[PDB]
């Protein structure tokens, strides 16, 4: 038997990504936020629209998806699609053609603790 | 059909396209990636853009996808959706204004003994240095940095099928001549 | 129709259609 | 099901060099997850080299360095190893073990090879020379088979005939490179005197067929 | 006639499209018959890579196919053959062209 | 990092802003702002026009 | 956080999202309609077009999705795909 599965069906079986992860609805999350630039395309003067290729990283805490390697068998990451956790959701709100989220979902990194890391790329064409 | 419709009712049974195909956590995923080049659409000097239509063939063997021909039939191999099937995530690392990933979820071939191989067709747009100083009797190096976005080596390894692209279904160009290609 | 219905629950009654078309296995 | 099939088994001279195959069917195999593991003759198992996912390159032991080279093809799901200045010391059965998806840091081998017997001699196609045990109540008499090369040989006793109690002991390889074996049985010492006993030897590579009456 | 996605479909694409797209523009229906022929006529908007012969432009003439075949199955699994019902040509209706 | 054909980035700091936080603007809000300031290689425009 | 998962479950066990959402058929949903113009991005002489950015505000009331903030830990907003 996989471990990862073991750990997969352990974190999630009984798990709601809707809801924040905060045992208080008056917590807040914290979210480390790093953008990364990968390329500059362009600057439409006529659209007065930047292009650029970048990467976000955003790192936060879940305590519903904490565990200990020494449990699952010494795994230390787990990848599992996006879609399954929680999100903060975050989008670029001075974007000029309509699109506020990332080009590509990537998986999310689930380390041991309940700290979750999602790196996604995105393509941006924002107002300038 | 009974015999391969009985099949794919069994492998999917109880199948996760969540965790690695492995059967220990422990074992390495072997990825034998080789791009071949269908057509060179597009070099944009001004954005720095090369535009490519490539086939990105991907090989690697999936331990919960296994049978025994003789229990079905004699079916020794199927074609399924690969949206239902663990995949490795392919990134274009220096992806400039195209898709980053593979968006065109064709068919994967599926061996009774686990093997995989997985041909979707993309769109590269790749972002490369054009140097203009010589034009038109200029020569451009332009690459496509390919890996697994959110696994690492120690989880995934990569390997390429061939120490060259394959050239072999490549449509001639009527402004560019390809004098060199290889893979590292 | 109904007659139409109740053919098409006969007909798509462990019906795949992922899966060829193949009575026997090297059927074309 | 997975089988491992290895080349045939070679005979070779020192300073030479063999390679050795293991082709892979039922299943399939990719660059790493290769270890060969030799076995000399009564002897241990003793690990020679592989290619592990964390050095992505064979490693080998100390006392192969220089020597050996090791080399996985997934594309035709077959391994090879070629060790190059053979020694007779290299004489030993080669195994491959292989994994069909290989642990990063280590190995297992859940699949085997029938092995195969690389035998490092400078001695010639040779037969044996053919001497009694003379019996001096059970009495034990036997043939010695002595400085014949290579091997195998068969010994029966009376055509086949006599079984019970018969007992072939596996061949020693003396100094000279030349294997040396016994074929004994134990009898009744009332029959030494009423009962024919002749061993029958035979050594396919020099046609030698020899039938040696033993009495006392 | 039945939904085409609720049926077997042979994988049959435009191999050599130049903008990307290899599929039909609308899926459609499916007519199949109680024999179990199935005919199936999909719409089809397709940019194909066609390379120019340029030396008499404007006073040309052009070569433009448009490859069609399985993008999964093997010659062993789906074979293919010209449609008709000796026609060897592509069909266009006098009326409505 | 490859360098833009035609811009050139010089600098690009971030800040992390938080406004509406008043009884009367109600719950408050917060997000980034990277402010990329980018300089124009003006050759062509030179050599050309 | 196990609150808000309960409460949405209790919400959505019989839910219908294409009837109006009201106690009474007779009854009428007030919806309250705020454009907020975030960007004029061109406008077309030639086709006689004006493109802009906009947020649509749309307030209203839905009957069925109510609950008592005391039996849910003391929840009193959630959000919910729409
Ligand atoms: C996760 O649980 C362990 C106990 O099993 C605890 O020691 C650790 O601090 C927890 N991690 C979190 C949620 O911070």
Same mark, same amino acid.
């Given at each position: 038997?996989?471990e990862?599965?073991?750990l997969?069906?352990?974190?999630?079986?009984?798990?709601?990504?809707?809801?924040?992860?905060?045992?208080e609805?008056?917590?807040?999350?914290?979210?480390?936020?790093?953008?990364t630039?990968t390329?500059?395309?362009s600057?439409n003067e006529?659209?007065?629209?930047?292009?650029?290729?970048?990467?976000?990283?955003?790192?936060?805490?879940?305590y519903?998806?904490?565990?200990?390697?020494?449990?699952?068998?010494?795994?230390?990451?787990?990848?599992?699609?996006?879609?399954?956790?929680?999100?903060?959701?975050?989008?670029?709100?001075?974007?000029?053609?309509?699109?506020?989220?990332?080009?590509?979902?990537?998986n999310?990194?689930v380390?041991?603790?309940?700290?979750?890391?999602?790196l996604?790329?995105?393509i941006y064409?924002?107002?300038? | 059909?009974?015999?391969?419709?009985?099949?794919?009712?069994?492998?999917?049974?109880?199948?996760?396209?969540?965790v690695?195909?492995v059967?220990?956590?422990?074992?390495?995923?072997?990825?034998?990636?080789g791009?071949?080049?269908?057509?060179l659409?597009?070099?944009?000097?001004?954005?720095?853009?090369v535009?490519?239509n490539?086939?990105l063939?991907?090989?690697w063997?999936?331990?919960?996808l296994?049978w025994?021909?003789?229990?079905?039939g004699?079916?020794?191999?199927?074609?399924?959706?690969?949206?239902?099937?663990?995949?490795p995530?392919?990134?274009?690392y220096?992806?400039?204004?195209?898709?980053?990933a593979?968006?065109?979820?064709?068919?994967?071939?599926?061996?009774?003994?686990?093997?995989?191989?997985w041909?979707?067709?993309?769109?590269?747009?790749?972002?490369?240095?054009?140097?203009?100083?010589?034009?038109?009797?200029?020569?451009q190096?332009?690459?496509?940095?390919?890996?697994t976005?959110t696994?690492?080596?120690?989880?995934?390894?990569?390997?390429?099928?061939?120490?060259?692209?394959?050239?072999?279904?490549?449509?001639?160009?009527?402004?560019?001549?390809?004098?060199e290609?290889?893979?590292? | 129709?109904?007659?139409?219905?109740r053919?098409?629950?006969?007909?798509?009654?462990?019906?795949?259609?992922?899966?060829?078309?193949?009575?026997?296995?090297?059927?074309? | 099901?997975?089988?491992?099939?290895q080349?045939?088994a070679?005979?070779?001279?020192?300073?030479?060099?063999?390679?050795?195959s293991?082709?892979?069917?039922?299943?399939?195999?990719?660059?790493?997850?290769?270890?060969?593991?030799?076995?000399?003759?009564?002897?241990?198992?003793?690990?020679?080299?592989?290619?592990?996912?964390?050095?992505?390159?064979?490693?080998?032991?100390?006392?192969?360095?220089?020597?050996?080279?090791?080399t996985?093809?997934?594309?035709?799901?077959?391994?090879?190893?070629?060790?190059?200045?053979?020694?007779?010391?290299?004489?030993?059965?080669?195994?491959?073990?292989?994994?069909?998806?290989?642990?990063?840091?280590?190995?297992?081998?859940?699949?085997w090879?029938?092995? =195969?017997?690389?035998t490092?001699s400078?001695?010639? =196609?040779?037969?044996?020379?053919?001497?009694?045990?003379?019996?001096?109540?059970?009495?034990?008499?036997?043939?010695?088979?002595?400085?014949?090369?290579?091997?195998?040989?068969?010994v029966?006793?009376?055509?086949?005939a006599?079984?019970?109690?018969?007992?072939?002991?596996?061949?020693?390889?003396?100094?000279?490179?030349?294997?040396?074996?016994s074929?004994?049985?134990?009898?009744?010492?009332?029959?030494?005197?009423?009962?024919?006993?002749?061993?029958?030897?035979n050594?396919?590579?020099?046609?030698?067929?020899?039938?040696?009456?033993?009495?006392? | 006639?039945?939904?085409?996605?609720?049926v077997?479909?042979?994988?049959?694409?435009?191999?050599?499209?130049?903008?990307?797209?290899?599929?039909?523009?609308?899926?459609?229906?499916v007519?199949?018959?109680?024999?179990?022929?199935?005919?199936?006529?999909?719409?089809?908007?397709?940019?194909?890579?066609?390379?120019?012969?340029?030396?008499?432009?404007?006073?040309?003439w052009?070569?433009?196919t448009?490859v069609?075949?399985?993008?999964?199955?093997?010659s062993?699994?789906?074979?293919?053959?010209?449609?008709?019902?000796?026609h060897?040509?592509?069909?266009?209706?006098?009326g409505?062209? | 990092?490859?360098?833009?054909?035609?811009?050139?980035?010089?600098?690009c700091?971030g800040?992390?802003?938080?406004?509406?936080?008043?009884?009367?603007?109600?719950?408050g809000?917060?997000?980034?702002?990277?402010? #990329?300031?980018?300089?124009?290689?003006p #050759?062509?425009?030179?050599?050309?026009?």
């Amino acid at each position: 038997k996989n471990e990862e599965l073991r750990l997969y069906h352990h974190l999630f079986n009984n798990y709601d990504p809707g809801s924040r992860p905060v045992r208080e609805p008056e917590d807040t999350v914290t979210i480390s936020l790093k953008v990364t630039l990968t390329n500059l395309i362009s600057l439409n003067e006529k659209e007065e629209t930047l292009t650029t290729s970048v990467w976000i990283g955003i790192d936060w805490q879940d305590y519903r998806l904490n565990y200990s390697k020494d449990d699952f068998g010494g795994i230390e990451t787990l990848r599992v699609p996006s879609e399954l956790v929680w999100l903060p959701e975050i989008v670029l709100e001075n974007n000029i053609d309509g699109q506020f989220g990332v080009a590509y979902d990537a998986n999310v990194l689930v380390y041991e603790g309940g700290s979750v890391t999602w790196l996604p790329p995105a393509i941006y064409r924002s107002v300038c | 059909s009974e015999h391969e419709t009985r099949l794919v009712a069994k492998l999917f049974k109880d199948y996760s396209s969540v965790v690695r195909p492995v059967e220990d956590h422990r074992q390495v995923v072997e990825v034998t990636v080789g791009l071949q080049l269908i057509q060179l659409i597009n070099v944009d000097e001004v954005n720095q853009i090369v535009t490519t239509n490539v086939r990105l063939k991907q090989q690697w063997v999936d331990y919960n996808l296994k049978w025994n021909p003789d229990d079905y039939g004699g079916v020794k191999k199927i074609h399924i959706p690969s949206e239902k099937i663990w995949r490795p995530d392919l990134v274009l690392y220096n992806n400039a204004d195209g898709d980053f990933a593979i968006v065109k979820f064709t068919k994967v071939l599926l061996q009774y003994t686990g093997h995989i191989t997985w041909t979707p067709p993309a769109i590269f747009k790749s972002y490369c240095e054009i140097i203009v100083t010589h034009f038109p009797f200029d020569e451009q190096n332009c690459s496509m940095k390919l890996g697994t976005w959110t696994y690492d080596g120690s989880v995934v390894a990569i390997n390429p099928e061939s120490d060259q692209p394959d050239l072999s279904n490549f449509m001639e160009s009527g402004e560019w001549v390809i004098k060199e290609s290889r893979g590292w | 129709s109904e007659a139409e219905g109740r053919l098409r629950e006969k007909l798509f009654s462990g019906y795949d259609s992922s899966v060829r078309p193949a009575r026997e296995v090297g059927d074309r | 099901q997975v089988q491992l099939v290895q080349s045939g088994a070679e005979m070779k001279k020192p300073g030479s060099s063999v390679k050795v195959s293991c082709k892979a069917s039922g299943g399939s195999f990719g660059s790493y997850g290769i270890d060969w593991v030799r076995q000399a003759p009564g002897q241990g198992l003793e690990w020679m080299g592989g290619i592990m996912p964390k050095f992505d390159a064979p490693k080998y032991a100390e006392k192969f360095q220089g020597r050996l080279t090791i080399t996985a093809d997934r594309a035709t799901n077959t391994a090879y190893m070629e060790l190059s200045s053979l020694r007779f010391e290299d004489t030993a059965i080669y195994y491959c073990a292989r994994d069909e998806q290989p642990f990063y840091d280590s190995w297992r081998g859940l699949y085997w090879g029938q092995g =195969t017997l690389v035998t490092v001699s400078s001695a010639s =196609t040779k037969g044996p020379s053919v001497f009694p045990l003379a019996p001096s109540g059970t009495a034990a008499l036997g043939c010695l088979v002595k400085d014949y090369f290579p091997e195998p040989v068969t010994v029966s006793w009376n055509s086949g005939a006599l079984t019970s109690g018969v007992h072939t002991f596996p061949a020693v390889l003396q100094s000279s490179g030349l294997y040396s074996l016994s074929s004994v049985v134990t009898v009744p010492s009332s029959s030494l005197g009423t009962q024919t006993y002749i061993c029958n030897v035979n050594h396919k590579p020099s046609n030698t067929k020899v039938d040696k009456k033993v009495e006392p | 006639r039945i939904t085409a996605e609720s049926v077997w479909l042979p994988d049959v694409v435009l191999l050599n499209n130049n903008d990307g797209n290899f599929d039909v523009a609308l899926d459609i229906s499916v007519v199949v018959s109680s024999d179990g022929s199935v005919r199936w006529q999909p719409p089809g908007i397709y940019r194909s890579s066609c390379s120019i012969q340029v030396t008499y432009f404007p006073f040309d003439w052009q070569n433009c196919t448009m490859v069609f075949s399985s993008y999964s199955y093997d010659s062993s699994e789906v074979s293919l053959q010209t449609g008709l019902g000796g026609h060897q040509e592509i069909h266009i209706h006098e009326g409505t062209f | 990092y490859t360098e833009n054909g035609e811009w050139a980035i010089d600098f690009c700091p971030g800040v992390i802003r938080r406004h509406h936080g008043g009884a009367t603007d109600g719950p408050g809000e917060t997000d980034v702002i990277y402010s #990329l300031i980018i300089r124009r290689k003006p #050759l062509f425009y030179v050599i050309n026009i």
